C-alpha cells in the first residue's frame, strides 16, 4: 500500500488526461468484442434476399467501424506514451535532485553502482506498469461490467454462482502477489550490490591485473551472481505462476454451472438453451477478471521496484534554517572557539581546536600522517557539521549563514584529484562560468598549466577520460589550482596541491601563486615545509591537538615538533 | 552462431520445453469438448450415471493442463536465468582484459549498463521465444488446415491480406536497428551524469555547480525520453494498422461468400464457422506483434554484447609464451619508443638503459616527461610501437602473464583502496599469507600502530575508493600490500607524497634493511631521498638524460642540476 | 521517539532557590549531551551548563557564576538544576539539548539540533517582585 498510493499518486496532475484515456479505451472495448456480433446482425436481415438488395447497405457501416477502431487504438497509445515517459522522467529527476541535498557521509559508505541501478534498472523496471498496462486495466473493468450486465439479463440465480467463487480467486491471488513482491525486492538489492562491483573494478582495473586478483574478483562476482540466479528463478516463476493456476480455478466454475444449472434443466426450471448460451457469456467474464488479477501481480512487481527508489527519497537532507541570511561583503575572517570533532564517532579525531585569522592572511598547517589537518578543512566546508564547538566566518556563525552563500567564497583542491568527463575548458570554467577565454588562458600560464594543454592533440577543447587519466597526477593537480583561482574566492584552501608536482616547477609557481594570494585569506596543507615558511601565522597539529603556534622563525628557535619535521627532511 | 553457444550447456531445459507444451495446447482446446458431453450426454440424456462420469473427469483433464502449465513456467525461468548468469561472467572476463586505451573507445559509464541492462533485455527475450517456440507454429500450420477443411474456396481471401502484412514487419525490423540503438546510448548518457556527480561530490558542492549538474542530468533525461518515444511511436502505429489489414479481410469474407452461395445451399454454415474462428486469429496476431517489438528492442542490445568479444584488447597472452616462475631481477631497455594513441605526440623516444639485478634505482624528471609511463613497461601494462623491453635475459611479451605479473608487483601514483577489510586488502598480493606475515609488512610501512588503535582492528570496515581513511593512510597501506607478496622486481611510483619527513625516513631506510639484493624502483621529487639509491636514471621529454651516481650526474647532466639548484 | 521533558519551579520572590529536573525519555545521561539554556522570550537564547557522559563533566554559566548547582542520576536519568539565590535577570522559557554529544569533550556550550530549535519544552519561572 505504502508505495502503491505513492507511485500511482504521480499520475495525479494528469488525472484530467486519465479520464480521457478511460473514455477512448471504453469505445474500443465496446466495439472490439462486438466484432463477431456486428457480422451476425447483417446476415440475419439479408437471410431471405441472399445476395444484394440490403447486403450492400450493411457493408458500408461495417467498414467505417473498423476504420474508427484502428484510428482510436493509435490515439490511445500516443496520448499515453508521453504520459508514461513523464512519470519515468519525474522519478529519475527526483532521485537525482535528492542526491545533491543528501549528506556526503552517505556517498562515502553506500556503493556508487547501487545508485546507478536505482537510476536506470529500478526506473526501467517501473517503465512496464506505465504504458499499455494502465490501458488494459481500464479495458478490463469495463469488459467485466459489460459481461455482468449480459449475465443477469439472461440468468439471475446462475450469475450469482459464477460471482460466489470470485472472492476465493482474489484470496489466492493476494498470497501469490505478496510472494512476488517478497522475491522481486530481494532480486533488485542483490543486483544493486552486484552493479557496484562492476563500477568498483572499472575504476582501478590496473590494481587487479598487477596483484593477480582477477580470479578472486571473478569468484567475488560469481558469489553474488549465484545468489542472483537462485533468487531470480524463484522471482520469475511467481511472476507467471498465477495465469496457469487460475485455469484450474476457472475449470471449477465450468463444472459448477453444468451441475447447478443442470439440476434446473432436469427438473424443468430454466430451458437447456438458457445454460447453453450462458457458457459463452461466462467466458467473456472470466477472461477480464483473470487479466486484472494477472495485472495485479505485475503492479506488485513494480511496487517492489518503486520501494527501492523511495528508500533514498526518504533519506535526510542538508537543510538551511528558516531564518537564513545571505553573506554581504566577504573578507574572510576565520574564527574558531574550542572545536572538538570525531569523524568515525568511534575514535576522536580532533581535541581542543581554536584559532583566529585576520582577513587576507597566509596560514600554514603541518604535522604527521593521519593527525586531523584535512578534517578541519571539511568542517570549514561544512561537509561534516560540528559536534561540539563554534565556527564564525566574517563575524557570523557557520550554522546561521546558508550553505550556498557560505561556500560562495571558498575554494579547495583535494588529495584525490577529481576530474570530470567533460572538456578541459569546461572543467576549468568551474566556479566562474562567466569567465572569458582571456581569463582561462592567462591563469594557466601563471601556474605552469598551459605547457601541457597546448601539447594535447585537441588543445583546450580536449576530452577528459575517467578521472582525467589522459594526463599524469602532477598535471591534474595544476589544473585544479587554476580551477580554484578562476572562481576568485576570498577564502582559499590548498590541500596537498603541490605533492605530485616536482620541486623545480614548484619554485617557478611559488612567487606567481603568492602574488595572487594577496588580499585573500589562505590556508595551505602540505608536507613540503620549505614552501610554507612565507605564512604569517603557522599552527602545528599532532594527533588532533595544537602543540605549537606562531611565526616560522619562532617555531625553529623553540625546538619542538616543527624542528623535528624540518631536520628529518635531509 | 556466437550467441547459440550459451544455450548449449542448458540444452536439457531447451529440449524438454516443446515436448510438454504440446500437452498444454490440446488440454486447453478440450475445454468445450468435455463441456458438450456433460450437458448433451449427461443433463439432456436424463441419467445421473453419465452426469458424474464426465463430472469428475473434467477436473482430471484440467489437472494435466494445470500441472503441465506450472511445470513449463519452472523450466522456462530456470533456463532464462542460467542464460543470463553464464553471459555476465563471460562478458566480465573480457572486461578485466581491457586497457586504459579501451575506455576511450567504449565509454566508462557504458560498460556498467552493458553488464546489466543489456543482459536483462536479452534475458526476457529467451523467455518470450520459449513460450511460443512450439505454441505459435502449432496453431498456424495446424490452424490453416482447419480453415481449409470447413471451406477450401473461402480460404482464398486470406492470401490477399498477406502483401501489406509481410511488408509491415520487415519495415519494423529495418527501422528497429538505428532507432533502438540511440536508446541504449542515451541510457549510458544518464549513467554518465549520475556517476560524474557520485565520483567527486566534494568538488561539485565546492563551486556550487549542483544547479549546472541538475541541468546536465535534465538535458540527458530529456534526450533519453525523446529517443524512447521515437522508436515506440512506430510500435503504437504498426499495431492498430496490423489489425486494420486483417479487418479489410473480415469485410472481404461477406463480399466473397455472397457470390459463393447462390445455388449450393450447403456452404451457408461454412461462412458462419469461418467468421467465429477469425476471433482466435484476431487476438493471436496482437500477441505475435507484441513479441516482434521486443526482438527489435533486443537487436540493438545484442549488437552491444557481441562487440565486447570482437574488440581485441591491447594486451593479451602470447602464442609462443613460456612460463617463468623464477625471476632474478634483470631489467633492460633497448631503443624503447612509445605513443599512447594514434593522434598523440611521442610520449617516449630513444630510451636506452640497463638496470643492475638487485639494485635500488631512482627515477627523476619534471611534470609530464615520462616516468610513470616507462615503469608500466616492466610488468607488461602497455606494448611499445618501436623497441623491446627485456626481463630476465629474454623479452617481456614472449613470457606468460600469470608468471610475470605473479612475481612482479607495482604500486601506482594514484593509490586505490578497494572495499572490505584491512586483512582482505593486505592479502591482495598473497591470499595464502599467514597472520604473522601480513602484520610484519605493516611494521615496515609503520601503519600497524593505526590498525591496533581501531575498535575492530584488521577486520574494521574499509570502503571503495579510499575516502574511508586519510590520503597518507591508504598510501602507506599500498606499499605494505606489495610487501606481503615479497616481489623480486618492486616498482614504487611516488611512494612518499602525503607522508611527513620523519615517517618518510623510517619507510625508505626500513625497506633497504629487509630487502637485500632485491631490484627496487622508487620515484621521488626530493634530492636527499634520491641519494640513498645506488644509481639514478633521469628522463626529460621522453628522451634519456643521464644514468649513474649523484656525484657524476651533477657535472654530466643538465636537467638534474636544475632540480638540485631549485631545491637549495 | 527522542524527546526531552523539563519540569520544576513555580512563582518565588527574588532570593529563593527552585529545583528544575530535565528528564530524558529514550536518552541516557551515561553518554548523550544534555544541558540547560537561559532563553528569553523575544530576545537572545543563552545557555546554563552542558553536562555529558557517565564519568561526568564539570560546567557552569558566565553571567551568573557558580550559582546553578547541577546533579545527575544514573538510574532515574534526570538533571537537577537548583538556581542558588534567584535574580530577576534570568526570566523566560528554558530549554534542554538533544543529541550532538556521543561521549565527553568540552561543550562551550550551544548545540546544533535540526528538529525545531531545542527539545524539552519551555517552563516559565519569573522571579520578579
Ligand atoms: N592515459 C593516458 N592517455 C594519454 N596520454 C597519457 C596517459 N597517461 C599519460 N599520458 C601522457 O604521457 C606523458 C608522460 O606521462 P607520465 O609518465 O604519467 O608522467 P610523469 O613523468 O609521471 O609526470 P608527473 O607524475 O606528473 S612528475 C605525458 O605527455 C602524458 O600526457
Ligand atoms: N571517512 C572517514 N571515516 C573515518 N575516519 C576518517 C575518515 N576521513 C578521515 N578520517 C580520520 O581522520 C583522521 C585524520 O585524517 P585527515 O584529517 O583526513 O588527514 P590528514 O590529517 O591530512 O592525514 P594524511 O592525509 O594521512 S597526511 C584519521 O584518524 C582518519 O581515520
Ligand atoms: Mg589529509
Ligand atoms: Mg607519475
Numbering used by the authors:
A (entry chain B): 22 to 591
B (entry chain A): 2 to 569
C (entry chain E): 1 to 129
Task: Give sentences copied directly from the paper behind this entry.
Nb_TM#2 binds side-ways to NBD288 and exhibits picomolar affinity for the transporter regardless whether ATP is present or not. Nevertheless, this nanobody partially inhibits ATPase activity by around 30% already at the lowest assayed concentration of 20 nM. Immobilized TM287/288 was stable within this time frame, because the maximal binding signal for the state-unspecific nanobody Nb_TM#2 only slightly decreased.
The NBDs undergo large conformational changes in response to ATP binding and hydrolysis, which are transmitted to the TMDs via coupling helices to assume inward-facing (IF), outward-facing (OF), and outward-occluded (Occ) conformations. The binders were instrumental to solve a crystal structure of the transporter in its OF state and were used to probe molecular events at the extracellular gate and their allosteric coupling with the NBDs.
